[PDB]
């Protein structure tokens, strides 16, 4: 465990070895779960990178949060994707926040605390368990076989999965920067491990 | 009776099927009313919706709140249709008030709390008092019929209804989400019946 | 006399027999006027119409506020006209004040508080005292002879002529809405006559 | 001497025998000036202008600030012209600010409180002692053979000369209309002379 | 030693003798360092510009922070050069930031106090402690050989230089213009030498 406040992962340079693995004390498959971190990078303008990679044994998409070029960001679950349409996109530090839910397959993504429409995806799902989350890579097996053209460069950090599907409160919340509690991956009770060309550096978003 | 306060209705896939009626607690035939809502969608740049449909035995488009393609938005009140233009539009929760007086034909039209012109429609006409009233779908029959081309996919909630003219004063009010007493349709007594793909969640717009 | 505060007339369709004629207690001719009103409309961007027209038994344009299609605001004194460039024109109620003066010809033109550039027109010209004041449609004869294409299609209210020069804190102080004390036109003191289908409803302006 | 507070000259009409003479009360050739005023016109899209012109017995330009068409502010000190680069011109009363030195060459250029870059214009030269100075025409002669094409249409005022350069916090405070002493022109103490049609009616400007 | 709190260097005309050489009290070789300045120029729409040059008897590009025209700011160290994207540039005095870091490459690059990406360039380099800054001019030998089209036109000032990397709040400090302790360059302790059309004058930004 490690207390990584004010603090953000760095990814300088294009690479296909530089990656951080999170490991998540998860027992039981999750039937909803929400993801808030924050990202900046400067290849929205260039080509298309990978954000918040997690994959199982059997789907190494299982949840991807990708970004794809002159089209948007790109949320898929289980191998299907939907879209979220960015019609103009800004040179800044940006905070991101995806929730599901399989009862339902409602899908919502926050930018900036704005939230967007939402959207169904995968009713009835079932997320595993076990799985290998790794950032600024995308995986397209079980923790191996990385991607020069998927990778990403620049900084990431305050990332936050929970269990469950947030509130538009606590997500207002979480994008205020106040006090939270997650329970599947903690910013503040991080498991990390670095491999490759990944400095830990502070964070220039307030 | 349900208290709907902070809450609102869900139609994440485009089908027909898909649909919610609100029963109100009309006996007299209305010679004024004005209806204030707030919903969410995307498909402001793709086609056309439906947003508040009211239908009689007689006439299945008796009040019905359309979104045209490039035009804007359409208010219609016993077959003949009123056009209110919409330059630019934006992706972002927005809030429509529709108001409507037969000794006059004047139609109020408020965007976001900003009044539009007003515009004369339908003098001397008489509003029918049974009708069924569906969010998402416009009909062109009696509660049935549907379509899935002017069907509506996104949030939608705050719907209220009165059986009178408002003055800006309270239309203000409206917008500013102060207390009120709506006596037609009101979202905290709501009597609602839902068929379909409809999830009731919690509102994204403050 | 009425009490018009925080009422406003409507004409809501396009047509030629709709007017409301204003009786002013004049028995001077002036020697200096200040003409302060608020109208909304959305003609703006479709063709012309008449704002403030006031006709004399010898020139039926002797003091006339027109819109000029893709050109903006005309103010014409005696016959002679001097045009005021209005690069974009937005879709908002407007509030326009305009002043002239004999002995100098200066004529000052505010929009929404902003004044604009001061021009001559008809230095040492006398304008009559008996009149008839029209709003919503622009006269061509003493009265009569209206126009469908010169008509004006909206709201109007919080006309007030003075007999002088108003000073710049004092054109402030009106756009403010504070008290303020006219004695040729007042809107408080009105003497108005409906003739047409023109309606009076709350003003939609704050 | 006049105290001409909250007043300034009005030039409303285009043409060639409107102008007013400063008189200045300079006895020793100045090694250093800062000249700040006020106007309002219109013709900024239209043609060039002339605003502030100071001519000796030798040099019709010897101090003059023109407005060049299609290019901005036009700056000349002895006859040798630097530019000012203005891509987008509003309609909207605005301050210059203008300081010069001999003993360096350093031109200051204030639009609104904005500085402006500094320039290098006519090192070591010495600026007359005696003078006319002519508010709205461009001189070419010594007080005469005046220009319709260089005149300006306009208001004008807060007209202030000093003999030295002024410091920044000098200058924001001039632009922020607190209190001040000129010694070589004072809007508070102006000598003036009035010839042609020019008329004294209060500013426009706050 | 001189305090020039409030005062800055003035390059008003191009040429290629105008420089000032800034010395610094530096024994050791620098393994990171952060330069902080303010400029102010018009030249960056129309040719390229040095603003801060650091050369030793090895390399004339040591340090050098360059500005690419149609390409924004050029930040170099050790011959190999990175690129800052500048879409759009503003007629206005802006504050950088440069930073860098031996040990893991990492170059930071501030704009009026808004970070950019962290990039990475030469890792492991070590940079020369004896050197000659020059400002204004762009330097390819050892403060010699200088460069007419490679020379600065405009002000500059508030060049302050660490040998450590600064952190973001230290960072926001000096954007706001609090208190600080440089130990390389001190704009408080300078040890400067004009050779030169250079002119000390007071800052024209707050
Ligand atoms: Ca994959
Ligand atoms: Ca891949
Ligand atoms: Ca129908
Ligand atoms: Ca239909
Ligand atoms: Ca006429
Ligand atoms: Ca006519
Ligand atoms: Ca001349
Ligand atoms: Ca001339
Ligand atoms: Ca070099
Ligand atoms: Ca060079």
Chains 1, 2, 3, 4, 5 share one sequence.
């Not at 951080?20 to 039937?31: D, E, N, R, Y």
């Not at 009862?103 to 995968?122: C, H, M, Q, T, Y």
Request: with cysteine; charged share 20%.
């Amino acid at each position: 465990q490690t207390d990584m406040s004010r603090k953000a992962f760095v990814f300088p340079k294009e690479s296909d070895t530089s990656y951080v693995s999170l490991k998540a004390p998860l027992t039981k498959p999750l039937k909803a779960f929400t993801v808030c971190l924050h990202f900046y990078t400067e290849l929205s303008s260039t080509r298309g990178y990978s954000i918040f990679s997690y994959a199982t044994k059997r789907q190494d998409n299982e949840i991807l949060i990708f970004w794809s070029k002159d089209i948007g960001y790109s949320f898929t679950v289980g191998g299907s994707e939907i879209l979220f349409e960015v019609p103009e996109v800004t040179v800044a530090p940006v905070h991101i926040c995806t929730s599901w839910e399989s009862a339902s397959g409602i899908v919502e993504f926050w930018v900036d605390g704005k939230p967007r429409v939402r959207k169904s995806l995968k009713k009835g799902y079932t997320v595993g368990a076990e799985a290998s989350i790794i950032l600024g890579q995308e995986q397209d097996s079980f923790g191996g076989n990385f991607e020069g053209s998927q990778s990403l460069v620049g900084d990431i950090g305050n990332v936050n999965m929970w269990d469950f599907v947030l509130s538009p409160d606590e997500i207002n919340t979480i994008y205020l920067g106040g006090p939270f509690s997650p329970n599947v991956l903690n910013w503040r009770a991080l498991k990390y491990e670095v491999q490759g060309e990944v400095f830990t550096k502070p964070q220039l978003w307030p």
